[PDB]
Write a protein that binds this DNA or RNA. Structure first.
Ligand code: SF4
Ligand SMILES: [Ca+2]
Length: 596
DNA sequence: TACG
């Protein structure tokens, strides 16, 4: 109700006079409706389309549900859009590649469609008149499936989801797409073109925008792994392993690359990840092979031209024209030409060994979004100054504070909590749990600590473990909402029903190379390394978790933070109490709330 | 100064 009116007003007027707007508003405030109504209002006046970017299928389904409602209220021409990597049914049938890209799939699809047009309808049996049928268009526009549901619909009806989405798109006013789809600039431009629209002509809603920095860093980062090298090696043998020069064959070049990477990892990586200089890869190359830099560069160029050859050979024989040689050479070459200030060259022994261009500053990647009107929504994004510096977005901001009765939520920190430190941490967690007897999830900073703590004990509990799983995460959540007690999980993972959360320590980031790189970056740039690389991400983590506790005026919930250093976060959690025995303090809180 |  009332919080929504003033937020919509603020969002609407802000768009007239700025390139975007940022709204913080708590969980349960209806961010997606506030954004939709503001954007639709604004866009109807000026004849613009609306693009809603989401990071996960869960954010996707939330938005698509809201949009389905409005559909009765008003006429809503919305579809999901995703690229061929997720929506092409055919290629995972005819091939099992371990890496893929959009361009290889365009070439592959276009060839399949030509074969179908030439009268070989079985070449791709998904490419048929149904792509443009009233049945298909009605299901998209009237049912408004998620991309997952539409893929499932497409399999069942023998019709291609990708092409169907693309055919409906000129007639969509609203598109729900992954950040990863739209922020791929190559893909983006084809996509705007099939939409029939310029960047000037859209309002983009950035769902859960507090992730925007990491979404930028992630799409801006790339790596070269040993395993990628190995797949290139195989590809080289299959395609003739030609001389690139001198008496250096493709496989020799690959061996040079791999052995350099392996030597770097063996000599440089101690405790874990380490930051190196970009030219160091080249140095190893030069010294191990007694070659100049210009000679190694020429060989890398020859390796890319070889990959071009492989893509061409694959294409003409009907395969997906993806080349690991091409993919590897372009990453090695880009790795060596990277902005030494905005990026960190990172060496890791993880996953068999890799080298990475870690994008430290996402403002560059995120900048194309300024060509559109943007709406940045999150529960978890003040101090805006921090967001602005980091994203490069200088736009009006409004915080909707608390909308729900403050007495229905108890947040506290306890300062009592090494091998003795664990035993205390466990004893403290135990009293709270056994004594309070309510549906709880305990968040740990690390899996190690989770395990270390998961004895002493015990009480029944479940664990968002190791490499869950996607499927298993659902069975787990569903268990927790019925035969329901205590869940353990880590702050990195994908996490009435939820009544308590216990933070077994503050989820500070690991002091690894990337994080130290980010610290150094923001320290050199703003003298705020600690604030931007440690404090702000941790506050965000904490609030996202707390935020799930109350999603209604009548919802009840407690959170306790088992950490001395928690008072430091009051400036992001201003209502937080200190406690000296949280067991009883919390216990008494739930009694009070039971009174009505 | 202060991150697992
Ligand atoms: S029509 Fe669809 S399924 Fe067939 S190749 Fe193209 S994208 Fe893949
Ligand atoms: Ca190519």
């Amino acid at each position: 109700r009332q919080y929504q009116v003033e937020a919509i007003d603020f969002l609407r007027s802000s768009l007239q006079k700025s390139y975007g707007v940022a709204l913080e508003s708590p969980t349960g405030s209806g961010k997606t409706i506030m954004a939709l109504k503001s954007a639709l209002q604004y866009s109807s006046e000026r004849k613009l389309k609306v693009l809603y970017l989401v990071r996960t299928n869960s954010q996707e389904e939330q938005v698509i549900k809201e949009l389905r409602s409005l559909s009765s209220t008003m006429k809503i021409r919305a579809i999901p859009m995703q690229g061929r990597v997720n929506m092409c049914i055919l290629y995972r049938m005819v091939d099992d590649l371990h890496e893929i890209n959009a361009e290889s799939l365009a070439k592959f699809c276009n060839m399949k469609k030509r074969e179908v047009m030439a009268g070989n309808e079985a070449a791709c049996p998904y490419f048929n008149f149904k792509i443009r049928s009233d049945e298909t268009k009605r299901f998209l526009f009237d049912e408004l499936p998620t991309a997952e549901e539409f893929y499932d619909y497409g399999e069942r009806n023998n019709v291609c989801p990708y092409e169907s989405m693309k055919a409906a798109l000129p007639d969509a006013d609203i598109v729900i797409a992954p950040y990863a789809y739209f922020l791929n600039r190559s893909v983006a431009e084809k996509f705007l073109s099939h939409w029939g629209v310029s960047r000037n002509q859209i309002v983009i809603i950035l769902d859960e925008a507090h992730n925007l920095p990491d979404i930028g860093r992630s799409i801006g980062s790339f790596r070269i792994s040993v395993e990628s090298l190995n797949r290139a090696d195989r590809e080289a043998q299959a395609y003739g392993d030609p001389e690139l020069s001198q008496k250096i064959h493709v496989s020799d070049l690959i061996e040079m690359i791999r052995s350099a990477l392996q030597s770097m990892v063996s000599e440089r990586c101690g405790k874990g990840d380490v930051r190196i200089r970009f030219q160091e890869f080249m140095e190893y190359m030069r010294i191990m092979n007694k070659r100049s830099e210009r000679e190694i560069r020429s060989l890398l160029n020859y390796l890319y031209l070889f990959g071009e050859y492989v893509e061409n050979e694959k294409e003409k024989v009907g395969k997906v024209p993806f080349s690991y040689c091409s993919s590897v050479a372009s990453r090695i070459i880009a790795f060596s030409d990277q902005d030494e200030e905005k990026y960190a060259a990172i060496l890791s022994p993880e996953d068999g060994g890799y080298m990475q261009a870690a994008c430290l500053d996402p403002s560059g990647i995120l900048e194309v979004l300024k060509e559109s009107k943007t709406i940045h929504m999150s529960g978890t994004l003040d101090p805006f100054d921090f967001y602005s510096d980091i994203t490069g977005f200088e736009i009006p901001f409004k915080k909707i504070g608390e909308i729900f009765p403050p007495e229905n939520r108890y947040i506290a920190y306890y300062d009592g909590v090494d091998e003795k430190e664990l035993d205390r941490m466990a004893t403290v967690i135990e009293d709270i749990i056994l004594k309070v007897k309510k549906n709880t999830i305990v968040y740990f900073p690390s899996y190690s600590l989770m395990d270390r703590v998961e004895n002493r004990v015990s009480f029944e509990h479940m664990k968002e473990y190791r490499g869950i799983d996607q499927k298993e995460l659902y069975s787990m959540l569903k268990k927790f909402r019925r035969d329901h007690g205590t869940i353990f999980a880590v702050s990195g993972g994908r996490l009435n029903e939820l009544e308590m959360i216990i933070l077994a320590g503050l989820p500070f980031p690991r002091p690894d190379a990337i994080n130290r790189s980010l610290f150094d970056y923001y320290e050199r740039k703003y003298g705020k390394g600690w604030e931007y690389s440690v404090v702000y991400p941790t506050a965000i983590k904490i609030r996202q978790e707390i935020g799930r506790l109350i999603r209604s005026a009548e919802d009840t919930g407690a959170c306790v933070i088992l950490d001395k250093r928690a008072g430091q976060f009051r400036k992001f959690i201003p209502d937080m109490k200190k406690t000296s025995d949280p067991a009883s303090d919390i216990y008494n809180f739930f009694i009070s709330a039971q009174a009505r």
